[model samples]
Target: NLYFQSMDPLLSVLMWGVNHSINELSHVQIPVMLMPDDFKAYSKIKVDNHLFNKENMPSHFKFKEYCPMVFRNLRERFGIDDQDFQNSLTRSAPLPNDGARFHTSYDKRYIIKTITSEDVAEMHNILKKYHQYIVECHGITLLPQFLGMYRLNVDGVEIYVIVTRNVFSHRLSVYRKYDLKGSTVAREASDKEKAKELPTLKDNDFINEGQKIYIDDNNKKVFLEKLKKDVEFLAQLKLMDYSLLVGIHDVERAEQEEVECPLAPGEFDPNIDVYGIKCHENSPRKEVYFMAIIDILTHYDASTVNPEQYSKRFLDFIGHIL
Candidate 1:
């Protein structure tokens, strides 16, 4: 009975090649894990059709054993262990709800990404130079600082792996949830107001009274103006190339549907706009710092795609606010 154990070096080498190729094009240096001898061995195995093919290959290709063994060997060579290695994976934390969600916990403050063989070997080379150029040109900081990479030799075979810091914030999603809830409430109230008038007092009348009772126009305006100022502060940071993908993700939580507004001259309705104050609920002041980071990452990714064009387009998109 042939016991086929999968190989880690094979997978690692494949990923390393791809990552290296992509990074080369982008002019960014990606940390890679592979030794010179390992590369030569990888090259030999890669082109060998008999060894590479599953049907013709020996019966030792099980991932369960191969992966663990590779990891174990890597640990030994690097003077680390399973616990140290596992720390690189993202951690799960308890949410307000019973279930847990994945986040970059303090323990795993860095994101350790694993690129697939296909991505590394095929796409990496094609996109490498462009990737470096894009990142450097735009001063994009979405990715974690590149750490040194390494290779693991398990039972003579080799595998490659890369390491980097985790780059995510909790505030973005929280803000999104808050925005969604506010939107739901606003939607409900609008629906009720439109559906029918109160037998005793019209819904609009009640809403108007509530607005008057809850908000003095002068005081409300003052508060809103303050909010605008705060938003302006955030916007300034954005101008400095701080990515804000997380912030936008949270902004999506606001339940503003695209609808026509007779009050506005534009194709879209102006009334259904995302209001800064409305989005400040839930985490409130304490969450802003985290949310701001998320926003920065979000914007950074968007801007990185086609730096100049995206920048101009984004500017035009938000020109009204300016």
Candidate 2:
């Protein structure tokens, strides 16, 4: 009951910690939820168990939770329940990615990214404005839906992790995924990268392949509006070098290939796959698209381009892709 049978060591601790802290949180009730100043709130716990097993968790570790109330409200606003958030993460350890930079939750409901303390500072710098935007838009935007931030201490090593909803579907397998920054020079995937099972292509590769999003006119308009607003907000914060992360799901390919069972044609759980969009009926190929803005913490200094010009260039480049 403490740790899942045969789960990663880190995940087991994360679940146990999340479960323990949340239950403790349930007792300290507050009125009117979190205030603006409450973004700085947090709950920290230290766990050092010297007795017992491997494959479950380490005997020596420290767990720190940041702004639980703020994150819980953000989760609710993003159409996610706090219990589900805890379950998705603690259920299992996140799967390993190609790099040490990121990990996806066992079920893929969330992503745990290794970030620096500087990134944490930048997050706090814009959290107020960002949270305000989410409330204004009613939590319907392409920006990352941030959940929680944590700091862990294991054997004297300090690690920081942030949680966000997965941009891609947790269930349906992604056929082709791309990381597009709208840059031409030095943006294509390296030879080594292309050798991977699902290589992350870039602007040059996408244009060369002549890829199209294949959404209807209305959907296209709505998507662009959100993108425009989102980019503007990022620009206002002077954050730049962000990319539009894209994942494609080919229904036709799925129909022809073998899987546990054929997924229903053009079918997806909208609730789980919030960012997914089905291809137009007249599309040349049956496809489902997942897209979102990422990497919004690069501080644009005086040496960088102005926000107006940057936003315009990004908007135009992303708009034409549809």
Candidate 3:
């Protein structure tokens, strides 16, 4: 039934990887508490598809899963079903783009991010504490909900991929997207980035947009509390940086759609889109806002990037809504 022609070979490789890793997990028992050894565990798989199947899949490749047990627990706690993960990715790989940084599933329900061995080590260092934080927050922090980490070895070239929750919605279309941090020194998207359809605009672009978002007194208080706890956790670990990924979904424009599309416009399950906020009766445009803290797995390497300074200014900026 591997009938998807015109698919990327890398997609074929990743499809093989996720399917193998997930099937292997079905046999393992859920743990009440994870041990240090769990953090270091991994799953390795190699595939060699037959000639007929070679039309859709790679004849040979290796798939490696790092800390499968830990990530399975993470997905469960974050309210993502493992079946959903496979259906979105292994069912159909995130379409080919040679971009090495990060990727969103075609359905936009999951995110696949690139990382280094050092990033893996950083996770190993903070995993227990990080898990503790997620547990305490009841899985409601702005931090990324990491689902899995893997290495896909195709023709002996190894590529690492980390899966996360997509900050935007699976059903809604985003009009604008931004990656924001709490810094003034050298924070902006390049001209190349701005040229895209839905460009990942930066802090400066956000200011120029100028319409401040407000979510009332109570919601603002709760939002800041989450931010405070999260930034404080990062501060404690000397984790210098992370960011709020802003995505604006315009509902008014969404009403017009292609007749062939199954999903209706202005529709989403709040349980799934946990961070979406609807603009109240009084607003310039009717839109849904998705704000999630992303890129927690890496640190800022620039001399001017400061987590200490970021935490302060980040708190000030977000208190005003997005």
Candidate 4:
């Protein structure tokens, strides 16, 4: 069972670390309010084994969870239990994405994105404000829901990772996807990109195809309201260059493919598929769209544009896309 746990030493250590971290967190008292010092707090553990568990993990390594209490509080506000979060991450080895920096939980419920130490510091800088925003919004926004952040030092190399809820459905396959920014300049996916199984289309591709998210009027209003609030919040934080990541799930096609087991067409659990919105009944096709703002950690600069202008442009683009 230990051998079967993972072939990759990094993944093995990650699983071990998360499991240990959550178990330790369970016994700690919940804070009345996050102290200034809590934002800088971290928990570190070093494992230096002689001949024990060498096959599954390295003999020496370190795991550090940044702002453990803050992230736990965030998980609680986002309606995720620590045990469940840990289970999703540590249940099995995460599936690798295209790059070394990205992975999905075995169950596809969470995304683990590797980041630089600088990004971790950036996250630290915005974290308090981000948490306050989430509190005010009551977890109802298009922004990425950050669950945890950690650092691992294996073989004298330090690696950082941040975890967030996946924007797309775990069960449903995304037939089409797009990474849209407000700007149209040089925004189309290349032919090489298009050749991929699930290419990330861009603003021009979406515009050229005349794609519009066909949700009902009431749903559209609610979605835009959330979008407006989220973008404005980003502007206030001087964050820019985020994308509205879109995934379209074809219900009819999925039904045919999943003959053995199926839920009702265009159906998804709001709690599970938080960003999913069912297409209007009278729409041309039966689809479930998963749309959310992603990559929000980028800081603004005059070399590009101001965050406020970017937000307005981004909101206008999405308004038209809808």
lDDT of 4 by residue, 1-322 (tens): 2232676667777888888899999889998988889888999999999999876778888999999999999998888999889888876788888733888999999999988876787799999999899889898889999998999887777789999999999888899999989663789999999999899999999989888788999999999999999999899888998989999999888888788775777888889889999998898989999999999888864256789889998999999888
Candidate 1, residues 1-322, lDDT tens digits: the string is 2112224334333333333332332462323643333222221122223545444233232111112222233333333333433433312221111011122323433333333343233222322332333234342222223332333333355444444333323222232221011111222234543454211122233344331112234534554443333334334323223222222222322223323233221122212111212223333222221111121122222213333443444333222221
Could you tell me every candidate's TM-score relative to the true structure? 0.27, 0.92, 0.89, 0.95
Pick by lDDT: which candidate is best? Answer: 4
Whole-structure CA lDDT of model 2: 0.80
Q: Compose the digit string of candidate 2's lDDT tens values, residues 181-263.
A: 77335689989999999999998888888888889999999899889889989988988878899999888787767555655
Error of 4 at 246 (Å): 0.7
Candidate 3 residue spans exceeding 4 A from truth: 1-6, 48-52, 96-99, 257-267, 300-306, 320-322
Cα RMSD, model 1: 17.8
Task: List CA RMSD, all candidates.
Answer: 17.8, 2.3, 2.9, 1.9
lDDT of each: 0.29, 0.80, 0.75, 0.88
lDDT of 3: 0.75
Best by TM-score: 4
lDDT, candidate 3, 136-175, per-residue tens: 8899988878888887777666777888887888788888
Ranking by lDDT: 4, 2, 3, 1
Residue pairs that clash (backbone atoms under 3 angstroms), model 4: none
